[PDB]
Design a protein around this ligand. Structure first.
Ligand SMILES: O=S(=O)(O)CCN1CCN(CCO[C@@H]2O[C@H](CO)[C@@H](O)[C@H](O)[C@H]2O)CC1
Ligand SMILES: [Cl-]
Ligand SMILES: [Cl-]
Ligand code: NA
Length: 472
């Protein structure tokens, strides 16, 4: 039983637009912040790589559907490129080529028995909106609503699973470094919090929009995808446990407390620690933006499920480190990783499968067991089809998730592997491989070929169980 998926549980795979599509300026698509980063700052990216072509999924979407069908995916999670649909960011111009493209992909999926799950925003802001300041400028919340309306109107008759945002914990960091994630602006501890504030407002507007203009007719569900690492106390002390709670609140709670609790608002520890630190440094005003009571009420409850992106764990101990000002310094935890944990091809990613079960329990207890859809989980290597490390990563994480479901009563409702295929891995270029399908980036045809992990995941999806040879 503990090795069998619930009957209604949805299994599949996931991608993101800039990581896979290419066709960066084709047929009316406008420029986004990742076009800008990779064109103007190739020094920020391994190999000076760009997403100009990537997997060429703009042209090769039918091949993506073919491999999803081979895999036996029930669901495909992909994102929509804002600037492909609204090239100027604002809703004055709708690019028919972009509408057609996503319709073509959606229709192909459905014709092959695969359900579309659509992320509206996976990091590719139109440059015209970044030029207003991007996420730190609250005007983007209404622009986001208008973008979502175009998506619901054009696609919502066939799409019933939506994510407003993917991982704003990461994308807010594009406002906390001059050399990092797009748009690579150095306002740590100030602009990243403003970005988070706008994203939360935007998410809430999009959910209310769905309620008001689309839900009765379309009958779908709207969530948000949040990334969170497990944070294990470095020792069993109460002080180290406090530091790990700080970590959860400063990383997951920053977004989930306003939306998924009955109280709403930011977590108290977030408000209080930033208030105190801001005062001690001489600011008249806290660096953390505030919600009014009316805004708290508007934002809380804006969810039909919680999307979780899970990859790894950290150790946390009591203390403070990092630069002043910064979210890490404000968070009041000293973070490390254990040298004993198996490694990947990504410095930040260690294999800690039991951390997945711990995190799912933390979420269950904090948010009153919301329906959780695992929107990303996966592993990097540098290449190869006999990807034993990735196979082990998937079988262990799936076993831990099944224990969370069956032993711990966590309401996990679906799981999409990150990623369907090797793709443009942001600042790492093509150097880190996360796919279950390999892609030859030197071959203009970009063939997709199954790794061992794709074969094992197909076996899992077909049998609806963990095969005996991978059981404890
Ligand atoms: O710049 S660094 O400080 O050294 C490392 C930045 N983090 C940001 C958070 N990512 C995890 C969640 O982010 C996911 O990660 C996947 C694998 O990286 C991506 O392909 C997905 O698009 C993304 O949603 C991990 C890398
Ligand atoms: Cl101890
Ligand atoms: Cl066997
Ligand atoms: Na339209």
């Amino acid at each position: 039983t503990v090795y069998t998926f619930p009957d209604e549980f949805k299994l599949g795979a996931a991608t993101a637009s800039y990581q896979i599509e290419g066709a960066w300026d084709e047929n009316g698509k406008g420029p986004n912040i990742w076009d800008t980063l990779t064109h103007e700052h190739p020094d920020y990216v391994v190999d000076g790589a760009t997403g100009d072509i990537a997997d060429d999924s703009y042209h090769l979407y039918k091949e993506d559907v073919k491999i999803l069908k081979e895999l036996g995916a029930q669901v495909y999670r992909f994102s929509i490129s804002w600037a492909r649909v609204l090239p100027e960011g604002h809703d004055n111009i709708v690019n028919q080529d972009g509408i057609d493209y996503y319709n073509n992909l959606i229709n192909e999926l459905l014709a092959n028995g695969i359900e579309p799950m659509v992320t509206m925003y996976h990091w590719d802001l139109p440059q015209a909106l970044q030029d207003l300041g991007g996420w730190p400028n609250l005007v983007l919340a209404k622009y986001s609503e208008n973008y979502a309306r175009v998506l619901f109107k054009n696609f919502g008759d066939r799409v019933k699973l939506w994510l407003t945002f993917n991982d704003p914990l990461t994308f807010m960091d594009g406002y906390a470094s001059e050399i990092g994630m797009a748009p690579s602006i150095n306002t740590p501890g100030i602009g990243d919090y403003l970005a988070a504030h706008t994203v939360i407002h935007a998410h809430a507007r999009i959910y209310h929009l769905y309620d008001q203009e689309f839900r009765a007719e379309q009958g779908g569900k709207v969530g948000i995808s949040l990334n969170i690492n497990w944070c294990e106390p470095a020792t069993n002390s109460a002080e180290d446990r406090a530091s790990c709670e700080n970590y959860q609140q400063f990383n997951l709670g920053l977004y989930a407390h306003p939306i998924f609790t009955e109280e709403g608002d930011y977590p108290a520890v977030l408000k209080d620690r930033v208030s105190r630190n801001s005062a001690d440094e001489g600011y008249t005003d806290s660096r953390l933006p505030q919600f009014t009571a009316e805004e708290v009420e508007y934002i809380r409850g804006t969810h039909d499920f919680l999307g979780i992106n899970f990859y790894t764990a950290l150790l946390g101990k009591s203390g403070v480190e990092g630069y002043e000002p910064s979210r890490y310094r404000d968070s009041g935890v000293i973070l490390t990783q254990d040298a004993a944990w198996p490694i990947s091809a990504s410095s930040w990613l260690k294999v800690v499968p039991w951390g997945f079960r711990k995190e799912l329990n933390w979420i269950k207890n904090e948010y009153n067991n919301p329906p959780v859809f695992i929107t990303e989980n996966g592993f990097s290597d540098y290449g190869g089809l006999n990807d034993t490390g990735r196979v082990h990563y998937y079988t262990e994480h799936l076993k831990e998730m099944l224990k969370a479901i069956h032993e711990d009563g966590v309401n996990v409702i679906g799981y999409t592997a990150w990623s369907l295929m090797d793709n443009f891995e942001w600042l790492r270029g093509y150097s880190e491989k996360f796919g279950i399908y390999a892609v030859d980036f030197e071959d203009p045809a970009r063939p997709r070929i199954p790794k061992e992990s794709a074969k094992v995941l197909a076996e899992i999806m077909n049998t609806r169980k963990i095969p005996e040879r991978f059981r404890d």
